[PDB]
Amino acid sequence: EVETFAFQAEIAQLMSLIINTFYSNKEIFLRELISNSSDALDKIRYESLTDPSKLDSGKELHINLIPNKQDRTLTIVDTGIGMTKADLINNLGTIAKSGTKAFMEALQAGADISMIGQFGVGFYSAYLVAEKVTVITKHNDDEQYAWESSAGGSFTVRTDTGEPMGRGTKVILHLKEDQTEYLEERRIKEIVKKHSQFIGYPITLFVEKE
Numbered sequence: 001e002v003e004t005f006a007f008q009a010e011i012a013q014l015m016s017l018i019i020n021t022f023y024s025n026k027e028i029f030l031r032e033l034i035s036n037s038s039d040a041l042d043k044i045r046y047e048s049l050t051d052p053s054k055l056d057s058g059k060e061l062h063i064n065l066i067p068n069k070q071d072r073t074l075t076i077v078d079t080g081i082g083m084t085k086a087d088l089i090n091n092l093g094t095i096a097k098s099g100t101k102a103f104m105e106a107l108q109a110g111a112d113i114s115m116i117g118q119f120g121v122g123f124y125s126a127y128l129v130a131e132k133v134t135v136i137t138k139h140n141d142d143e144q145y146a147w148e149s150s151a152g153g154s155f156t157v158r159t160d161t162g163e164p165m166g167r168g169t170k171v172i173l174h175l176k177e178d179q180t181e182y183l184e185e186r187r188i189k190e191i192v193k194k195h196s197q198f199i200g201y202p203i204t205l206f207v208e209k210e
């Protein structure tokens with residue numbers, strides 16, 4: 001069973017802006033996704049402060065970056081708090097309608113696209129580099145779900161029967177054919193060093209067989 005939903009008009013507007021605006025500094029997508037992962041890790045950490053059994057689904061708090069040149073995907077995995085089905089439907093746990101408005105008002109007032117994260121909607125910068133994004137997520141006491149969108153005004157949610165994750169979120173970026181530099185080890189390392197060098201969780205960049 002696959003359910004199909006329409007994006008709210010403001011989010012669809014945001015996504016078509018991101019897809020169609022000429023903007024060369026595309027690398028900021030990775031900073032925004034790692035920062036979102038860090039926020040999700042903070043939240044399961046905080047909750048474990050009073051209920052340590054919330055770490056029963058996995059005690060290790062980390063971020064993995066997995067390039068796959070064969071599939072042309074870059075995947076960002078975290079063991080953060082994850083998302084419920086309701087979270088996914090509510091724009092992946094974001095206040096995206098008010099955030100998009102405040103991002104718009106700021107764009108009109110002398111901001112550039114790189115500030116997107118200050119308005120809570122940094123996730124959508126993924127569409128600077130990805131033609132399709134798949135989000136696999138597992139929250140404690142809910143099932144594992146897969147969210148997906150190639151923009152165009154709609155997204156899908158299904159129960160995920162793939163590899164069970166213990167807890168957390170996997171963002172799978174299906175890269176545009178001209179954006180494969182983000183699969184290169186030295187390029188990913190350069191971006192992480194430039195924009196994410198002080199994140200408070202281990203970031204492991206996986207390598208690939210030649």
Ligand SMILES: COC(=O)c1c(O)cc(O)c(C(=O)OC)c1CCc1nccn1Cc1ccccc1
Binds near residue numbers: 078082094
């Ligand atoms: C829309 O962002 C994400 O796609 C995203 C991510 O890339 C990595 C993640 O691990 C998570 C996650 O599962 O957060 C539970 C999300 C979705 C939630 C989210 N939306 C904006 C920021 N966040 C992270 C967050 C913020 C406040 C409290 C907890 C977590």
Ligand SMILES: [Mg+2]
Binds near residue numbers: 039
């Ligand atoms: Mg963030």
Ligand SMILES: [Mg+2]
Binds near residue numbers: 058060061079166
């Ligand atoms: Mg874990």
Ligand SMILES: [Mg+2]
Binds near residue numbers: 066067068
């Ligand atoms: Mg792989």
Ligand SMILES: [Mg+2]
Binds near residue numbers: 097098099
């Ligand atoms: Mg809102």
Ligand SMILES: [Mg+2]
Binds near residue numbers: 001002160
């Ligand atoms: Mg289903």
Ligand SMILES: [Mg+2]
Binds near residue numbers: 203204205206
């Ligand atoms: Mg590494």
